[PDB]
């Protein structure tokens, strides 16, 4: 888009992550975000979170992350970090199932509390959700809720899903 963006201070870091083809793929992103430490600890930054980010920030349908998309990524991660810190009211560095229920309610989701508890356990070892997994969980919920809403033309909270539509929709996030 802007060939002179080589002068941006983030460009060198972008280029190192991107390597030979000048684009960032989710594996490269995984390594980047892991070695950036942003999620804390020693575990890898969840690859599924990286794949969701590459997909959702994509501006040119390239399926890879370029420099402006990488610039946006950091702003988005900063926003999520603030959102995470804010619902981590006991400052454990993790979001528990009760903390998650509040976060999701505050975002306007209207979910069965049992289901929230189940979801929390699905994105953690012991109910305590790390930053990378918090993003994955919340983004997936929004994407699936959005997909459902678009198909729910009567706004009746029930969708008729033909199999093909169901599979393509769910398997894509």
């Amino acid at each position: 888009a802007f060939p002179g963006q080589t002068q941006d201070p983030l460009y060198g870091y972008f280029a190192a992550v991107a390597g030979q083809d000048g684009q960032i793929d989710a594996d490269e992103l995984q390594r980047c975000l892991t070695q950036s430490g942003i999620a804390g600890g020693y575990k890898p930054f969840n690859l599924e979170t990286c794949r969701l980010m590459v997909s959702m920030l994509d501006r040119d349908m390239s399926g890879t992350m370029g420099f402006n998309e990488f610039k946006e990524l950091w702003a988005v991660l900063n926003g999520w970090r603030q959102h995470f810190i804010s619902f981590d009211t006991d400052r454990s560095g993790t979001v528990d199932p009760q903390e998650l229920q509040k976060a999701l309610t505050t975002m306007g989701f209207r979910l069965s509390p049992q289901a929230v508890n189940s979801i929390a356990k699905r994105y953690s070892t012991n109910g305590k959700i790390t930053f990378d997994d918090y993003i994955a969980c919340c983004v997936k919920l929004r994407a699936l809720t959005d997909s459902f809403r678009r198909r729910d033309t009567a706004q009746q909270g029930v969708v008729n899903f033909p199999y093909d539509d169901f599979i393509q929709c769910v398997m894509s996030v």
Binding site: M56, L57, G79, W80, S86, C138, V139, R142
Partner: peptide, 6 residues
């Protein structure tokens, strides 16, 4: 919807 909504 990749930004937080809360």
């Amino acid at each position: 919807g990749y930004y937080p909504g809360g």
